[PDB]
């Protein structure tokens, strides 16, 4: 049922638009985005032509593949991420906060998160009531009643006393997850947290420490993981080297290789958004944007076939979220930021 | 009757190993060097001395000297540290010290006197222009120390800049007044003393939020105006999680370090890091030079020039991996000496 958008202009408040050319042009929106705005929540659902977004605390829905956006509800948090689930369902959650809710069509059920500091959420494609969640100590939690109740699952990803930035769940297999921590680098599980294996390759120095700020298992190939981190040995004081790179694993998160470096031409931060292509395992989108000096936003496209990074530029202050049209993934939905300087 | 003081370099190429060159046009062109800088190299130490046409540099562990305004560089000695910074004193003297280390030595002409630092984690050194043998030093706990015998012996001076358990990225001394110093802390923002650390005023303006936490990584008092201070920091409130904002800016004070205003933001056109080198003009209080460089994708080095008259930043670009130190010709400050980096 899914189709490409049958429009060139979007009817909505300006928080969500789309591009058909990797950001070279953005569809005009009827509304003008107002400061202060972030759009951290944006997903395509399995339901044909249906998307959800959260613009600040406003949950929005489109049922015509992004041509029209309408308010559904106001959520109890002003900064939520979305994770799609089977059957017109999604989970809304505050990254590094405690807010957690379930969306069923347009109905919102606020849940009791088992963690006050959520760093990842994953859903079971085969079992729509099955959902997992990670806390910032590296503990995974499991629910089989659509998030109504929760049990701890498995062991801590890096053992006790660790600070975990992120857990990315393989969309094809919730038993497969990657964790990124402070000084502890990366870890990977394939048995739902029963055992964890430390990743290598995030430092150019054997056994070197690193921060793994963000990770994303490719929906295109369970063996491909994209990551953002700092090699703490490379970032030795007085070196003046930041040590910040993007990385790629091709063995499911066991070993990583540097693929992009933090430069003015490929600008990285500790918060760079990672958007792997859902169909091409070679392709990673990422972005940089700032309102300062009205610099605008760079939308980057990495392709592992050559290792090269292309970029387009637009005038918005940032892109907070990216989703892909399932029928034509070259159509990309962009959730936008506007901050008044 | 003539004196023969400082002059601009009377040469077109530099005879030396390639760690130090000069520019007459803010980095648009760099003087060629006879030698080719080799990996792995950093030149963290570089100063112009008071003595006519004399400079010192440290290229890794090699102390180097020039007596012809940078046209010829020769080895002086191998130092006990491979990463040292230089602070000029009067006449022919400088102090060599390892930032965030314990190595400390005095250079007089070509003579190196190894000293015993009162701190194993040095974050700042300042010299007294009026008293040749008077020097001060800061440790990473925020303690200042005082020596009146050219660094041979030391006594603690004043109180900790921030207090117990609050460590310090830097202490910058006013070159015109060793009683005036700026301290930069981890989450504790900035402080300033005008009485040699007896009292410390907490700075404002490093966070856009009143009382907000911040990191003050680097600070430099203008040699052209004791009230002008340039600084590198992160506004930790602005850098809130999920905001995506890095919170990193350059700042300027016009009251000696009591209050700061943002002047430059971290963008691809004005690239900042937690280690951005700060080099205020020695003669124009409006002008600050700073640097960004990386060898990744052979990006090279941007040398930036901020001017408070207009608020604008200009830049030049060169192909080196980085500029690790900057000094100015005292007689002709548009002549700038650059210490360079090279990494495989
Ligand atoms: Ca960067
Ligand atoms: Ca704007
Ligand atoms: Ca930067
Ligand atoms: Ca090089």
UniProtKB/Swiss-Prot annotation, chain A:
GO terms for cellular component: extracellular region. The keyword Secreted applies. Keywords: Secreted, Signal. The keyword ATP-binding does not apply. Its main location: secreted. Gene3D superfamilies: YVTN repeat-like/Quinoprotein amine dehydrogenase. It is found in: Secreted. On the 2D-gel the determined pI of this protein is: 7.1, its MW is: 39 kDa. Induces autolysis of dispase and thermolysin. This is Dispase autolysis-inducing protein. The gene is daip.
């Amino acid at each position: 049922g899914w189709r490409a958008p049958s429009c060139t202009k979007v009817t909505g408040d300006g928080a969500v638009t789309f591009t058909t050319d990797d950001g070279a042009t953005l569809a005009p929106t009827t509304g003008t985005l107002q400061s202060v705005s972030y759009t951290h929540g944006l997903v395509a659902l399995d339901t044909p032509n249906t998307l959800l977004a959260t613009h600040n605390d406003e949950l929005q829905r489109s049922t015509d593949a992004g041509c029209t956006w309408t308010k559904v509800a106001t959520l109890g948090s002003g900064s939520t991420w979305l994770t799609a689930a089977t059957g017109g369902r999604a989970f809304a959650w505050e990254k590094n906060g405690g807010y957690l809710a379930r969306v069923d069509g347009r109905t919102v059920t606020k849940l009791s998160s088992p963690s006050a500091d959520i760093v990842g959420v994953g859903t079971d494609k085969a079992r729509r009531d099955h959902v997992r969640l990670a806390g910032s100590d590296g503990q995974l939690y499991d629910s089989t009643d659509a998030g109504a109740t929760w049990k701890p699952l498995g062991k801590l990803a890096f053992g006790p006393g660790a600070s975990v930035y992120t857990v990315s769940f393989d969309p094809a297999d919730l038993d497969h997850a990657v964790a990124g921590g402070m000084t502890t680098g990366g870890a990977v599980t394939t048995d739902g947290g029963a055992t964890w294996t430390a990743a290598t390759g995030l430092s150019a120095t054997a056994g070197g420490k690193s921060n793994l700020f963000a990770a994303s298992v490719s929906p295109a190939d369970r063996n491909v993981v994209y990551a953002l981190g700092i090699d703490l040995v490379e970032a030795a004081p007085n070196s003046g080297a930041e040590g910040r790179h993007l990385y790629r694993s091709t063995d499911g998160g066991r070993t990583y290789t540097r693929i992009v470096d933090d430069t003015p031409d490929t600008e990285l931060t500790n918060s760079t958004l990672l958007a792997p292509s859902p169909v091409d395992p070679n392709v990673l989108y990422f972005e940089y944007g700032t309102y300062f000096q009205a610099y605008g936003t760079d939308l980057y496209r990495y392709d592992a076939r050559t290792g090269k990074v292309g970029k387009t530029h637009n005038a918005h202050d940032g892109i907070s979220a990216i989703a892909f049209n399932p029928a034509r993934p070259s159509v990309m939905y962009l959730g936008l930021e506007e901050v008044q300087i």
